[PDB]
């Protein structure tokens, strides 16, 4: 992995720094590293691609080196370097694609392709140089078992889940009390609804709770908390819990009462925010517990009083909502996010070459299933393929 990353980094630096007219002192170390890469790869035979529609490709290296005494690079030097750079970039891209389409249950962190396995040999270690990318840094630290985390903008930590729970219900679904939520990406929209508007509830308060268990621990997370759930604020016709019938929801939004957000780790209260909206910080947590309340307005104007009678029928249904958005976070494991393209790259490579479904990942590289059952083996394979995808994106 480090050798493949070093190949990609050397090729990127050759594209960027080996330019016409540049001082040789601007590229001396880069030229030395490039010549080391040529020397190491020369005389070695590689084979990539025997899975899905990824065609078999054979790679031989018999390239020449680059000069070392000129004072400024010229067009001849760049032309000499460009063909080698193109061939090496093609080889690296094919190796990355070969490794991205492979998985195993036993050792998903170890290389799977033949080319990357050969590059794991000691002789290729000479190609290794600056490992400065976030993913390669995390790879190296994690191999040593050091505390290292990936930073995500809008981490995709919540598997898709649009569900409801009815604490009070009956066949006609005209007097319901419960919660409906959407868990999607970095977003939780929860809405507790009472059809009776807590007319008979103790102290005219109805309590709603929503617990979301994250499959991985998020640290140093910035959260935007708002007191309404726009998703559950308009009339809806919703299937029954068994799909036998459809019920009606006609929300009227009351502000949530006694809003408490508890970010917990291993069942311990790490962060607690009461009646706080806007930006909050959850430093370390694996569970989010949102507790809110619908309180009857003790004083109602004639229209508000008309909305909520003393008894059935309840035509307007009181609703309180909360919206939670993880703007950024840090996780020790790799996750899909709105800023990176690692999941997109891996999925694209697997789809373009019709890779048969393996024994680790769900078919089609579905992220909802992947994060629903994010096992250690799945974490290993995902980290491997994501690191390879970042390496490839360095050039492609």
């Amino acid at each position: 992995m480090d050798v493949l990353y070093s190949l990609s980094k050397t090729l990127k630096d050759a594209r960027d720094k080996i330019v016409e007219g540049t001082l040789y002192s601007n590229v001396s170390d880069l030229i030395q590293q490039f010549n080391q890469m040529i020397i190491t790869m020369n005389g070695n035979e590689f084979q990539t691609g025997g899975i899905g529609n990824l065609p078999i490709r054979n790679w031989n290296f018999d390239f020449g080196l680059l000069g070392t005494t000129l004072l400024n690079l010229d067009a001849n030097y760049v032309e000499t370097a460009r063909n080698t750079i193109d061939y090496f970039v093609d080889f690296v891209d094919n190796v990355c694609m070969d490794e991205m389409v492979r998985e195993s249950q036993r050792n998903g962190i170890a290389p799977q392709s033949d080319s990357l396995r050969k590059l794991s040999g000691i002789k290729f270690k000479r190609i290794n140089f600056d490992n400065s990318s976030e993913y390669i840094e995390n790879w190296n630290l994690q191999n040593r078992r050091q505390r290292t985390g990936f930073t995500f903008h809008k981490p995709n930590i919540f598997p898709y889940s649009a569900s409801f729970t009815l604490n009070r219900s009956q066949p006609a679904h005209d007097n319901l009390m419960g919660t409906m939520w959407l868990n999607a990406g970095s977003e939780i929209q929860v809405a507790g609804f009472d059809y009776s508007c807590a007319i008979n509830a103790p102290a005219n308060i109805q309590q709603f709770e929503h617990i979301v268990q994250l499959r991985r621990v998020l640290t140093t997370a910035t959260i935007t908390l708002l007191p309404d759930a726009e998703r559950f604020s308009f009339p809806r016709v919703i299937n029954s819990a068994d799909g036998a019938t459809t019920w009606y929801f006609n929300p009227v939004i009351l502000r949530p009462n006694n809003v408490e957000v508890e970010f917990l780790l291993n069942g311990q209260i790490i962060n607690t925010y009461q009646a706080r909206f806007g930006t909050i910080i959850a430093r370390n947590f694996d569970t989010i517990r949102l507790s809110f309340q619908l309180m009857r307005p003790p004083n109602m104007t004639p229209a508000v009083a008309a909305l909520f009678p003393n008894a059935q029928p309840f035509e307007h249904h009181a609703t309180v909502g909360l919206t939670l958005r993880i703007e950024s976070a840090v996780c020790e494991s790799v996750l899909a996010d709105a800023s990176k393209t690692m999941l997109a790259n891996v999925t694209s490579v697997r789809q373009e070459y019709a890779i048969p479904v393996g024994p680790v990942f769900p078919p089609g590289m579905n992220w909802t299933d992947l994060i629903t059952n994010y096992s250690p083996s799945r974490e290993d394979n995902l980290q491997r393929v994501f690191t390879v995808a970042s390496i490839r994106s360095m050039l492609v």
Partner: protein
């Protein structure tokens, strides 16, 4: 022998040199890395000001690779030499240390040699073509030992007048080479275009080689003379001479 390895049974004509085999067969990092460098330290080709030049690895130019050499042979000084008689082993290790303890002098010598080579190569005007020659210059390894063990710290670089004289001699030789090529091509083309079928281009080629001033024409193989005639025939005539001929 240092690493207790069975002596190499090297086969002549093997595409790998003995050091290339040893690099793969030796596990020690110091010696293996030095072997890798020695294997891959061939000349690099670069065109400067239109002249092809054979240039050295940057690690030779700054003399840093000598450290690696030192590293490697320092390891050789710590090796057991399992079955070697101990007095001969001591002598070998003490010679290895004789070379090792001159690390600074050898780095200075490598930098001096590389700098002198670069400075004198700046004065070369004809392409530095690398060809395995028929005869060689015999280099005594005892002279190499003398240079390694006797080099001090007195930097000696080519004098500016020496550089100018070398460049002038190279320019004069190159210009004479080109001018005599032009004369030979012009005369050959004139003889052909004048339909002088009894003319012997061999005499023209002999005069050309004689005017190059560095050839004993009596020892030029005939096949090479005729190849020279053909190649001279294939060249186009210089503009001034061609206009005069027209």
């Amino acid at each position: 022998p240092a690493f207790g390895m069975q002596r190499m049974h090297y086969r002549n004509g093997d595409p790998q040199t003995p050091f290339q085999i040893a690099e793969q067969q030796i596990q020690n990092f110091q010696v293996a890395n030095w072997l890798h460098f020695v294997n891959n330290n061939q000349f690099r080709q670069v065109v400067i000001d239109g002249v092809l030049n054979q240039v050295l690895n940057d690690n030779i130019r700054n003399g840093h690779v000598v450290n690696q050499l030192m590293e490697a042979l320092m390891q050789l000084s710590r090796q057991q030499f399992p079955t070697m008689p101990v007095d001969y082993k001591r002598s070998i290790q003490r010679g290895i240390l004789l070379l090792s303890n001159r690390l600074g002098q050898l780095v200075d010598l490598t930098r001096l040699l590389a700098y002198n080579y670069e400075t004198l190569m700046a004065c070369i005007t004809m392409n530095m073509q690398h060809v395995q020659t028929l005869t060689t210059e015999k280099l005594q390894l005892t002279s190499v030992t003398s240079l390694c063990m006797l080099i001090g710290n007195a930097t000696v670089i080519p004098s500016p007048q020496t550089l100018f004289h070398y460049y002038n001699v190279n320019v004069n030789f190159h210009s004479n080479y080109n001018e005599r090529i032009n004369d030979a091509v012009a005369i050959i083309t004139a003889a052909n275009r004048l339909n002088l079928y009894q003319k012997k281009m061999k005499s023209i080629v002999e005069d050309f080689l004689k005017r190059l001033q560095i050839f004993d024409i009596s020892r030029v193989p005939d096949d090479q003379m005729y190849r020279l005639r053909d190649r001279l025939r294939l060249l186009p005539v210089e503009i001034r001479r061609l206009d005069i001929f027209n």
